[PDB]
Design an enzyme around this catalytic site. Structure first.
Site, mmCIF file in Angstrom:
data_model
loop_
_atom_site.group_PDB
_atom_site.id
_atom_site.type_symbol
_atom_site.label_atom_id
_atom_site.label_comp_id
_atom_site.label_asym_id
_atom_site.label_seq_id
_atom_site.Cartn_x
_atom_site.Cartn_y
_atom_site.Cartn_z
ATOM 1 N N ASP C 43 0.713 -1.073 -0.160
ATOM 2 C CA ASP C 43 -0.191 -0.285 0.044
ATOM 3 C C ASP C 43 0.981 0.991 0.059
ATOM 4 O OD1 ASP C 43 -2.632 1.979 0.913
ATOM 5 O OD2 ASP C 43 -1.003 1.674 2.430
ATOM 6 N N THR C 76 -2.783 6.635 -3.029
ATOM 7 C CA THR C 76 -2.035 7.625 -3.090
ATOM 8 C C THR C 76 -0.887 6.801 -4.032
ATOM 9 O OG1 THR C 76 -0.289 5.513 -1.873
ATOM 10 C CG2 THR C 76 -2.409 6.687 -0.853
ATOM 11 N N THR C 77 -0.579 6.070 -4.527
ATOM 12 C CA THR C 77 0.728 6.297 -5.666
ATOM 13 C C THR C 77 0.281 6.437 -6.766
ATOM 14 O OG1 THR C 77 1.677 4.010 -6.377
ATOM 15 C CG2 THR C 77 -0.619 2.841 -5.913
ATOM 16 N N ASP C 377 -8.997 -1.124 4.530
ATOM 17 C CA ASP C 377 -8.452 -0.491 3.073
ATOM 18 C C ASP C 377 -9.523 -0.975 2.327
ATOM 19 O OD1 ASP C 377 -6.142 0.156 3.825
ATOM 20 O OD2 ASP C 377 -5.143 0.169 2.045
HETATM 21 N N1 LIG Z 1 -8.870 -6.810 -10.548
HETATM 22 C C1 LIG Z 1 -8.212 -5.658 -11.444
HETATM 23 N N2 LIG Z 1 -8.332 -5.475 -12.527
HETATM 24 C C2 LIG Z 1 -7.717 -4.317 -13.503
HETATM 25 N N3 LIG Z 1 -7.550 -2.659 -11.659
HETATM 26 C C3 LIG Z 1 -8.042 -3.475 -11.072
HETATM 27 C C4 LIG Z 1 -7.947 -4.628 -10.222
HETATM 28 N N4 LIG Z 1 -8.170 -4.044 -8.636
HETATM 29 C C5 LIG Z 1 -7.458 -3.127 -8.715
HETATM 30 N N5 LIG Z 1 -7.648 -1.829 -10.063
HETATM 31 C C6 LIG Z 1 -6.463 -1.089 -10.220
HETATM 32 O O1 LIG Z 1 -6.066 -0.929 -9.090
HETATM 33 C C7 LIG Z 1 -5.786 0.757 -8.475
HETATM 34 C C8 LIG Z 1 -6.010 0.950 -7.272
HETATM 35 O O2 LIG Z 1 -4.687 0.172 -7.223
HETATM 36 P P1 LIG Z 1 -3.487 1.088 -5.952
HETATM 37 O O3 LIG Z 1 -3.312 3.011 -6.185
HETATM 38 O O4 LIG Z 1 -2.467 0.645 -6.178
HETATM 39 O O5 LIG Z 1 -4.225 1.435 -4.464
HETATM 40 P P2 LIG Z 1 -4.643 2.599 -4.131
HETATM 41 O O6 LIG Z 1 -5.533 2.669 -3.852
HETATM 42 O O7 LIG Z 1 -3.921 1.850 -2.376
HETATM 43 O O8 LIG Z 1 -3.442 3.408 -3.742
HETATM 44 C C9 LIG Z 1 -7.582 1.178 -8.999
HETATM 45 O O9 LIG Z 1 -7.533 2.408 -10.136
HETATM 46 C C10 LIG Z 1 -8.537 -0.276 -10.380
HETATM 47 O O10 LIG Z 1 -7.987 0.961 -11.141
#
Ligand SMILES: Nc1ncnc2c1ncn2[C@@H]1O[C@H](COP(=O)(O)OP(=O)(O)O)[C@@H](O)[C@H]1O
Ligand SMILES: Nc1ncnc2c1ncn2[C@@H]1O[C@H](COP(=O)(O)OP(=O)(O)O)[C@@H](O)[C@H]1O
Ligand SMILES: Nc1ncnc2c1ncn2[C@@H]1O[C@H](COP(=O)(O)OP(=O)(O)O)[C@@H](O)[C@H]1O
Ligand SMILES: Nc1ncnc2c1ncn2[C@@H]1O[C@H](COP(=O)(O)OP(=O)(O)O)[C@@H](O)[C@H]1O
Lengths: 477, 72, 508, 508
Positions: C43, C76-77, C377
């Site tokens: 995360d 965040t990322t 989360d």
């Molecule tokens: N199964 C999936 N297939 C494609 N994209 C996904 C999937 N699950 C999550 N995502 C993508 O990951 C993104 C969020 O990941 P990330 O930014 O790494 O987590 P955080 O929100 O903690 O920063 C979302 O914008 C979503 O579009």
């Protein structure tokens, strides 16, 4: 020694002048400060960056102190003074090198400033007092473009009452004013709209035990610092006496026997404002006792507890020179801006009483005065005329930095502004601070107080002559 | 471009003091190491072997000036 | 002139460091401390709060980003990637003049257009169990293993749909995550009411409590003595020898007060009188009262007693006696469960069963922490999806359509702000690119395929992180939160403007 | 593996060096020699032949550019700028992997589209004096001072129009250019026919002669009945006396033939036959020839005979014993001009109304070389313009049109070659950008205005290098050559793909 010392002073001046030359205007760039530990702060204010920066040259320290002391004098313009002084010294570079004594330069600068004052007094368009429409136009011109964009009404009403509750008709007609006798109450809590104005000072302190009378139809407040004084007060029997000594229950009943209501644990910050609002006189010496011991205080009092805390309400004072501007809201992150804005508005009202004028903003006034001096210089003679033209030319620094921190090319815009401005007789065309385009200021509705402009120009010229008068700095290291 | 301007400025400053009737004299040591005193600008410049090409341009322009006017 | 370049380099370095974390298929980093203990996480929030950053302004970016996006769920990322790409794109135009104010105006115009686009793209499909399943899966597969996330989605979604009955999103107290160290990490469920950390020294006192009454009130079976007289036991120890005594009368007073409390509100040895103490208790009075049917325990934290106030009932004052039993409440079951060596008290089926706790059985500390963060989360994401009521197509669906809308919005704005708008679009394009790159497929192959098929599709479309094929996230089950997108766009624009407006740096 | 960064950095540095040279208001550059010689120039045709080039691949780019420019010789700086921008744009995508070969495919597709698009924006009309004035101005203002071009364009357009034979193009030797050492430039005039390099300034020479004839002699005072010239054999008794009388009779024996040849045509040489010798002639024979108007001269270069063969007619063979009246070439109006020091033979109304000579005049070569190069490449450009039947708009008007065509051709391409054509189109915008930069105005702002105007209006809007404003670029007569652009489109692509396909530089 020789020219080298003055050159060092004025170079140290130019460095701190142009370190923040971009930081003014409605599109100011944000500067970058780091202390040698990794701490990071992002700043957009000239005073803050000049305070936090550390420099050692005496000339730089002197000009920083000049800016700091001018900050409280007038408020706005605290960076334009530094920019003007730096540019004037940078143009005096060229005259110091060609071996002319600083005395003729000082004389030319003083003549230029004398012309400055008259030219500013000439072109300034008049403005009336307390009329709502152009007052709110002024509010938009100066108070806005900050974090009170969506809450300008509260600042407007607070300023409108403030400019009327600090009137001093001491030696003339209301021309005297102060910014420190206003009983401001910045108490967090509730919506920001809870702010209000109350005529007369009010005190955060009151009697510990409210088993006693405080409000009387004729409050004769008397200032004071052993019961001998308590029953010597009976000389006139004022209803309320303000002191700084603790009162016991038996002492409180002694006060009732003395027909007085004393107070305890009250600081001078409240006492002086109480005295200003009520217009009383303090006396404690037994020989000093006379018919003038007691002066009539306010016209009314009230007992009320607002926000679960005990207050003293001195309402409807005899002299409305120290009144209360209550202020309630979420926190203080909005109200410091309100404080500086009301200070600026009180200065505007004070100068409109002094000189009811508003010079055009956006460099229009600078262009007008520069044109006036560069046309007047053609007639007068003497080798002193070179600094006379140089100061006028270097005064163009405000429009050039305004255009610079906007994206537009300064050179073409400046040439268009000046060339248009010369043919124009009484136009006072300026430059838009948000888009960097030429526009008449009367159309754009931007204006500047006359007193602050006079103070800025005079302070800049005085700083220039002070830093060019110095002939040596050596008294040690 | 500032280096060329600096070179031309220094070259002009070298012979500026010789302007007019009140020109300072110059100690001229030729290639063959001979004493020589004069104040004429053309004599020293024709002896000055400057190196900056901008100086070359300005000096050859001066030479063309002397070609059909004889002075100045 | 050069301070801008320094800030650009720092931001690009931070972006490059955080590149290989976005997406469920993205790899995860691990954190090492000076002590030696290590943390394994993916995360962005914890990564930025725990990384030891070298460059100063990079630390500024991390701190301000975490501070702003603590409000929303996550992203965040993605925010860091977008701000880095924004800075790089702005630099490619700044390197040839292009005063930063114009780029700022372009950025603000692009932000306005993107906000309107997101407003008109958001899909308001009515909430049900299936959409919550999908949101939980999407928010959980990006923080933990695949099958672990699949197991945990059911637990979290059931807990959240249980919570949703109040018609108002509330959190923190009402959902509690308990931590313990069973070998079988596969065990993960939810328990209604409350679960107490541990109990006291009681040999089979009540066990199956069934109906119960809760008073707690921090019983004083081991009431504080007068041990402290002067420092410690001196030669004048008669104070700490006799004055320490005679306080047993307090213990007996509490014993008898509980005695008539129990045989006043119960009338029988059944109907366990649930009471707790904030400190230890003597086993003698404890088992003497428990043999009468009183459920007495010890050594509990505050958070459990405040939850008992709202989910079980009963006042709590350490100094007390018998009083009005009006504050006392009822519990459906206060059964105690023990796994191996440590005792868990299951205070469930109580009055107001709204409060629910979450059970996990992580094997070691770091897996437990990762599970806790992942479930937190997921809870926040599903709560936000509940609040907005309008989910949005994820997997880069909104980003590519936003970029296309910004490009088609180019002639609308005058001046040179079109360059800022174009850079903003190219920066927002980064998210599907990072998704494809982290998955393993080629960057521009996937990007070109997605854009080409979206050109005629009209509907939103994302990337399948198993083959690189374009995929309609709406019909598959990939979902994001409206508030997440709103806050991400706004904060991204703000920080990009703040960094781009810098001109020079000096010491302090 | 990615070792092409050094090549691309060298190309970018070369582009930076050749920047600030396009357009009439470009910045002139000064070339210093090792010995101290100074040359002022702006054209890249010679500017890519510096004393040093530093980086090796930078020298390779210069080599191929100066090898491929000689077909047209008008876009070397433009070609180098386009190469630098192409490589930079390709780098922006090669940084994230994206193997260069697909970029080369995109470049090929973009080249095909651009060559296809070239066929419409070109305008094909009949060309006459006023039309060629614009071409000469455009091809000359970029290589000389502005004021001088005003007088030189009119001096070159009339010359080229008069010497255009037919649809067949001109010859390199058909045009010859002569100079002198006049202190003042005193404009530049035009002379028809051959001009003598140097002659004999004997006072008895004839200047104004009409209907003359010409013959060339090699040696007439060295060897008797022999055309060889060498030192006299003093040691040889027979040779010394034979050459002493050959100093007298070896000229007169054919002088009598010359005088009878001219007198049978006209009594007492009314037509005034003229003769030229490779070397000096006997002063007595010189006087004898000048008395009859034969005008004996010297210093006949090895090319004058060939030039007058097609200009003054006849054959100027150096073999003696002319005999038959067939080697003489008619000179309708021979005029001897002796401006300052050197005497020149103006053969007007010779047996050719073609093969004119220019009268370029100016100060020392430091600038006269620049003037002659400017007139030379202006003549080359006007030759190409009169050769081809079409002309194209200048001032970067065509470049923006190609950019829009390539952008609108983006979806028609498949795969990442779309990104390749996009990069090529984006790199094509360098010409308006560098023109705006050289003119001093804002770089991006001018292009923004130009593109905004060209979007709504099909007219190929151009850039006016005095106000930084969009301009129609058609009626202003800013036309540039067409074949140069067509060849440039190929020549940029070939070098771009060649450099982009390199790998693993080796130290052979
Ligand atoms: N199964 C999936 N297939 C494609 N994209 C996904 C999937 N699950 C999550 N995502 C993508 O990951 C993104 C969020 O990941 P990330 O930014 O790494 O987590 P955080 O929100 O903690 O920063 C979302 O914008 C979503 O579009
Ligand atoms: N919106 C605007 N448009 C044009 N000029 C402005 C604008 N806002 C401020 N200015 C000009 O900027 C000058 C400096 O004011 P400001 O930067 O607000 O405070 P300070 O003088 O303390 O830096 C003023 O003289 C004013 O004329
Ligand atoms: N008596 C004089 N008073 C003032 N100026 C003079 C006098 N005599 C000559 N000059 C000035 O001197 C200048 C030329 O001097 P100088 O530069 O030394 O040689 P040159 O004639 O080669 O320029 C002239 O422009 C002239 O005006
Ligand atoms: N009057 C003019 N206004 C605008 N552009 C001009 C003008 N004259 C010439 N140009 C520009 O000059 C360019 C050709 O010069 P260039 O290709 O640099 O010559 P070379 O490459 O041989 O140095 C053309 O692209 C044309 O647009």
């Amino acid at each position: 020694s020789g020219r080298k010392v003055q050159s060092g002073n004025i170079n140290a001046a130019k460095t701190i002048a142009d370190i923040i030359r971009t930081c003014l205007g409605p599109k100011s760039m944000m500067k970058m400060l780091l202390d040698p530990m990794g701490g990071i702060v992002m700043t957009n204010d000239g005073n803050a960056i000049l305070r936090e920066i550390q420099v050692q040259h005496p000339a730089a320290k002197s000009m920083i102190e000049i800016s700091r002391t001018q900050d409280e004098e007038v408020g706005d313009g605290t960076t334009s003074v530094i920019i003007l002084a730096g540019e004037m010294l940078s143009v005096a570079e060229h005259f110091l090198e060609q071996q002319m004594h600083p005395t003729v330069v000082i004389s030319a600068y003083r003549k230029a400033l004398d012309d400055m004052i008259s030219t500013l007094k000439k072109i300034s368009i008049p403005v009336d007092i307390s009329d709502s429409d152009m007052m709110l136009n002024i509010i938009n011109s100066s108070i806005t473009t900050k974090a009170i964009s969506r809450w300008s009404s509260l600042a407007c009403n607070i300023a409108l009452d403030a400019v009327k509750m600090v009137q001093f008709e001491e030696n003339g007609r209301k021309e005297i004013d102060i910014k420190k006798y206003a009983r401001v109450e910045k108490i967090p809590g509730g919506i920001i709209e809870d702010s209000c104005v109350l005529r007369g000072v009010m005190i955060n302190k009151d009697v510990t035990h409210p088993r006693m009378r405080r409000y009387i139809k004729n409050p004769r407040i008397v200032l004071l610092d052993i019961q001998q004084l308590c029953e010597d007060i009976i000389q006139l029997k004022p209803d309320v006496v303000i002191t700084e000594k603790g009162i016991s229950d038996l002492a409180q009943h002694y006060l009732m026997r003395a027909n007085i209501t004393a107070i305890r644990r009250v600081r001078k910050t409240d006492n002086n404002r109480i005295a200003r609002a009520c217009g009383a006189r303090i006396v404690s010496r037994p020989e000093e006792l006379r018919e003038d011991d007691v002066g009539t205080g306010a016209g009314l009092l009230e007992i009320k507890k607002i926000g679960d805390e005990y207050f003293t309400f001195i309402t409807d004072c005899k002299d409305p020179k120290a009144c209360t501007i209550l202020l309630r809201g979420a926190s203080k992150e909005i109200l410091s801006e309100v404080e500086r804005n009301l200070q600026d508005a009180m200065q505007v009202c004070r100068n409109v009483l002094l000189d009811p004028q508003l010079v055009p903003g956006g460099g229009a006034s600078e262009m007008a005065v520069a044109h006036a001096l560069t046309e007047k210089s053609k007639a007068m003679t003497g080798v002193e005329q070179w600094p006379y033209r140089a100061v006028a030319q270097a005064l163009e620094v405000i429009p050039r930095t305004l255009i610079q921190n906007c994206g537009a090319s300064t050179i073409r815009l400046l040439t268009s502004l000046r060339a248009k401005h010369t043919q124009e007789n009484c136009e006072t065309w300026g430059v838009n601070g948000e888009t960097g385009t030429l526009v008449d200021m009367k159309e754009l509705g931007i204006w500047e107080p006359l007193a602050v402009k006079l103070q800025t120009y005079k302070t800049a010229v005085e700083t220039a002559v002070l830093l060019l008068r110095i002939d040596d700095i050596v008294s040690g290291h | 471009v500032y280096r060329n301007i600096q070179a031309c400025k220094e070259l002009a400053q070298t012979t500026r003091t010789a302007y007019g009737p009140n020109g300072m004299n110059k100690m001229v040591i030729n290639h063959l190491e001979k004493l020589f005193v004069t104040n004429d600008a053309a004599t020293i410049l024709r002896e000055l072997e400057v190196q900056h090409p901008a100086a070359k341009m300005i000096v050859m322009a001066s030479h063309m000036q002397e070609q059909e006017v004889g002075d100045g | 002139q050069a301070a801008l370049a320094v800030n650009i380099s720092a931001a690009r370095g931070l972006q490059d460091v955080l590149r290989t974390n976005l997406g469920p298929k993205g790899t995860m980093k691990m954190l090492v401390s000076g002590a030696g203990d290590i943390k394994l996480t993916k995360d962005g929030n914890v990564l930025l709060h725990e990384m030891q950053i070298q460059h100063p302004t990079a630390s500024l970016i991390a701190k301000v980003a975490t501070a702003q996006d603590d409000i929303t769920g996550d992203g965040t990322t993605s925010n860091v990637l977008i701000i880095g790409e924004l800075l790089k794109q702005a630099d490619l135009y700044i390197s040839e003049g292009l005063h930063p104010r114009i780029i700022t105006e372009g950025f603000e115009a692009a932000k306005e257009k993107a906000l309107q686009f997101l407003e008109e793209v958001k899909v308001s499909r009515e909430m049900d169990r299936e959409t919550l399943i999908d949101v939980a899966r999407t928010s959980l597969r990006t923080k933990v293993h695949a099958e672990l996330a699949d197991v945990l989605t059911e637990a979290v979604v059931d807990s959240i749909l249980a919570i949703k009955k109040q018609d108002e999103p509330i959190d923190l107290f009402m959902i509690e995550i308990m931590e313990m160290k069973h070998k079988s990490e596969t065990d993960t469920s939810l328990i209604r009411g409350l679960v107490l950390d541990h109990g006291a020294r009681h040999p089979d006192m009540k066990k199956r409590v069934e109906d119960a009454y809760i008073l707690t009130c921090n019983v004083s079976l081991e009431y504080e003595k007068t041990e402290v007289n002067s420092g410690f036991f001196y030669k004048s120890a008669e104070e700490r020898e006799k004055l320490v005594k005679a306080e047993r009368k307090f213990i007996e007073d509490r014993v008898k007060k509980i005695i008539e409390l129990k045989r006043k509100v119960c009338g029988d040895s059944d109907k366990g009188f649930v009471v707790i103490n904030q400190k230890g208790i003597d086993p003698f009075s404890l088992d003497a009262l428990s043999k009468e049917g009183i459920v007495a325990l010890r050594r509990a934290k505050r958070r459990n007693m405040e939850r008992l106030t709202l989910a079980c009932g009963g006042v709590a004052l350490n100094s007390f006696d018998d009083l009005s039993p009006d504050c006392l409440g009822h519990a459906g079951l206060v059964y105690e469960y023990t796994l191996g060596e440590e005792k868990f008290t299951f205070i469930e089926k109580c009055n107001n069963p709204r409060s629910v706790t979450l059970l996990i059985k992580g094997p070691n500390k770091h897996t437990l922490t990762q599970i806790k963060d992942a479930v937190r989360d997921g809870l926040r994401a599903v709560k936000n999806a509940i609040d907005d009521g309008c989910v949005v197509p994820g997997a880069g669906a909104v980003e590519v359509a936003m970029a296309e809308a910004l490009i088609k919005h180019k002639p609308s704005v005058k001046g040179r702000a079109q360059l800022g708008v174009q850079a903003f679009a190219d920066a927002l394009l980064i998210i599907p690119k990072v998704l494809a790159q982290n998955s393993g497929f080629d960057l521009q192959e996937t990007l070109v395929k997605i854009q080409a098929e979206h050109s005629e599709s009209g509907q939103l479309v994302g990337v399948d992180l198993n083959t690189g094929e374009p995929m309609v996230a709406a019909e598959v089950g990939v979902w994001d939160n409206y508030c997440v997108k709103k806050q991400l766009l706004h904060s991204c624009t703000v920080i990009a403007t703040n960094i781009l407006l810098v001109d020079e740096i000096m010491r302090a």
